[PDB]
Amino acid sequence: KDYLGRDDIDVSVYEPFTNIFYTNKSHLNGEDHLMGYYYRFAVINVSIGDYFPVEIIDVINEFKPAGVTLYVTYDGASTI
């Protein structure tokens, strides 16, 4: 929000390890997925509701903790 212009944009961080398929609790045809490469701890996917230079990725590299893989998701539905 301090590299883009403003605060009112939608920005959230997704943590896929919360949707790891456990034997008991996870629903069979639910939202959870089988553990693997993407559904894994030390992984985050950041959804950004506006246009950006590629270099914002490097800004997140300055802030994110060491050892965590980063993916960045542009959401088209905000810009229309």
Partner: protein, 58 residues
């Protein structure tokens, strides 16, 4: 018949499919589990029928 909505058992002998190979980072389908045992039971039935007949006392 388990092919209907509440179970969706997708096994079919005509398709000659013999193994449900699961992949990582995918959701788990109840139909896959049902087919997983349906294949083994069907081939066990075939093995038995090749030897015995229905009503054969042992």
């Amino acid at each position: 018949n388990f092919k209907g909505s509440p179970y969706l058992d997708r096994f079919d002998p005509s398709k000659d499919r013999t193994k449900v190979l699961f992949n990582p980072d995918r959701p788990l389908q109840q139909a896959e589990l049902n087919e997983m045992q349906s294949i083994d039971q069907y081939y066990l039935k075939n093995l038995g029928d090749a030897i015995f007949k229905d009503g054969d006392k042992q």
